[PDB]
Amino acid sequence: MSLTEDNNNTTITIAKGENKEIILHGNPTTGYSWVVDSSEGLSNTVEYVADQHSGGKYHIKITGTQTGEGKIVLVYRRTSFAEYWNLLSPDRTFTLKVNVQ
């Protein structure tokens, strides 16, 4: 039904528009959280759900959005001081919206 840590580095099949759920234990009181590092062919949502009876579980709901070989990579990370401080000085950016017809 749902994927967990044991499904790490495997391949699954889903229908375009079908939802599936990944559940991973996490403890955000440390400052770490599960975040989507990259994906392809999918949309997603990430939610933290506290264990009601340390830490809790991240629910990453994926939905197949384009037919083909997709992928999702999640990382358990904590943003560093250096990363926050770097953001005070923004890099030159080029942004282009593209309507694909």
Binding site: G31, T79, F81, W85
Partner: protein
Amino acid sequence: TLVRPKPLLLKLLKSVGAQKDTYTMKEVLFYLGQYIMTKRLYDEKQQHIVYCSNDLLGDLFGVPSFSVKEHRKIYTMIYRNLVVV
């Protein structure tokens, strides 16, 4: 954008290896980052939070702590501690 830091900020910048009286804003931000890194003033679990109430930095910013996420607040506090040339 060239600036001359007021004396507290200048003392902070020189404590981490700066040797000038005039700086670019890029340099000011760099040395201020070096300072916070070297003295590990940031919170380990939430590393955008900087504790400085017992620090020279707290004196010149006039706060017990601040968040690096609050960009305009940071720039405001820095600007109050320098004069543009």
